[PDB]
Amino acid sequence: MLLNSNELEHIHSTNHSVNDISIRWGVIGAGQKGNKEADLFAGYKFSNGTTCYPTLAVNFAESDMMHLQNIIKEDRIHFVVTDLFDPETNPNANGYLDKLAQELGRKFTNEEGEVIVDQFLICLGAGGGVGTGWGSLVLQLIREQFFPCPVSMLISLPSGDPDEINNALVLLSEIDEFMREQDRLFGNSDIKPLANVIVNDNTQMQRIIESQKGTKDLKNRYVNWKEVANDNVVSTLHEINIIPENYGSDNVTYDPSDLIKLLSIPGRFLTIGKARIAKFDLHSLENSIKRSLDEGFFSAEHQFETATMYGGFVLRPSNADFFKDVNTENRIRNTLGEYKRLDEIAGKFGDPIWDNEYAVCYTIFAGMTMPKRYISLAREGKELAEKQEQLRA
Ligand SMILES: Nc1nc2c(ncn2[C@@H]2O[C@H](COP(=O)(O)OP(=O)(O)OP(O)(O)=S)[C@@H](O)[C@H]2O)c(=O)[nH]1
């Protein structure tokens, strides 16, 4: 099975009853980046050997997905992107539609036509052609009530390319508009057709990866940082899914129902901060949580102040005085409070226990408005395009 992180290693190593998750994701990747992500999700298995998430990958040609390793060929669906399905500016548009519907219907339904997932997790890299194109397509499909369940979009943001930036800003703007209409029409407590959008910033993940690993001068120079980024992003998502359902606490227990609400009710931008805490002291704890939020894999200058829900849990060792001290609890609370006053929004923070000697703090903020990365990207995009036009001879 896939053991994408030290935490997944420790879990399946000390827990042989990991046979269910909090929410049954139906994973669908689109474009190279998306496919790579979905291929990792397809690699996860329960203690009993069965597969965790049914997944499909999408792209234009068979060639694009030739190197997938966990998604069998049958599930590798092949067919700008918006034109094809557009019942007009592309003949037999319904053809592609019916095919998408059939493939989705055959992979996410049992024998009697019943959906076997709770929510669709669509992964894609913004900035590319098929990627952003699919993202934009997903929005129109949701507006057309295409999906039988809510959809969660996991999106990476580009950099270094003005053309990719512009494509990503167009999508984000379309996402934000969709969210505005959905937020006005649905009650703050109803399940939303667009559950959430989780953004990843390539520039941010690259810096994190290239700063670490290389305490000398040999950065290996051959390791694709993106592969490392994908592992970190996907294992975090998988981990937050299995923890609530497989781990409990003797104090504040976080349940799958809490996770489900957090992921489906807010309906806007959501982020995650995973902080491993081996050093059991207040300053190290605060510092690790803050780094995970402001300089972690899911950081994108989020508008934490606009969050409407939060959640999370510190998976801590049994019989560890540090994580049974009021000063610790107060530090965690006080630390999250610097991002968004918890007393003002729904949500809870649990402290599940696992059979290991270090703790991991998973902090989640949901229902936020446009990540400010939209702004820094629009600025960087303008600069690149300028130095581009400039210098030119
Ligand atoms: N985080 C992450 N980003 C990736 C990965 N592969 C590509 N990217 C980034 O994602 C963006 C789009 O990637 P890609 O998936 O190639 O787009 P696409 O539309 O599917 O490809 P095309 O149609 O332009 S060739 C680019 O900005 C690229 O730098 C990956 O495995 N992880």
Curated annotation (Swiss-Prot):
Q: Which organism is it from?
A: Bacillus thuringiensis subsp. israelensis
Out of the domains of life, which is the source? Answer: Bacteria
Residues holding Mg(2+): 64
The stretch of residues making up the signal peptide is none
Q: What else is known?
A: N-terminally tagged protein does not form filaments, C-terminally tagged protein does so, but not as well as untagged protein. The pBtoxis plasmid encodes all the major endotoxin proteins (Cyt1Aa, Cry4Aa, Cry4Ba, and Cry11Aa) responsible for the mosquito larvicidal activity of strain 4Q2.
Listed GO molecular functions? GTP binding; GTPase activity; identical protein binding; metal ion binding
What is the designated name of this protein? Tubulin-like protein TubZ
The protein finds application as follows: A miniplasmid containing this and upstream gene tubR is able to replicate in B.thuringiensis subsp. israelensis and express insect toxin proteins. The miniplasmid could be used to make plasmids for insect toxin overexpression.
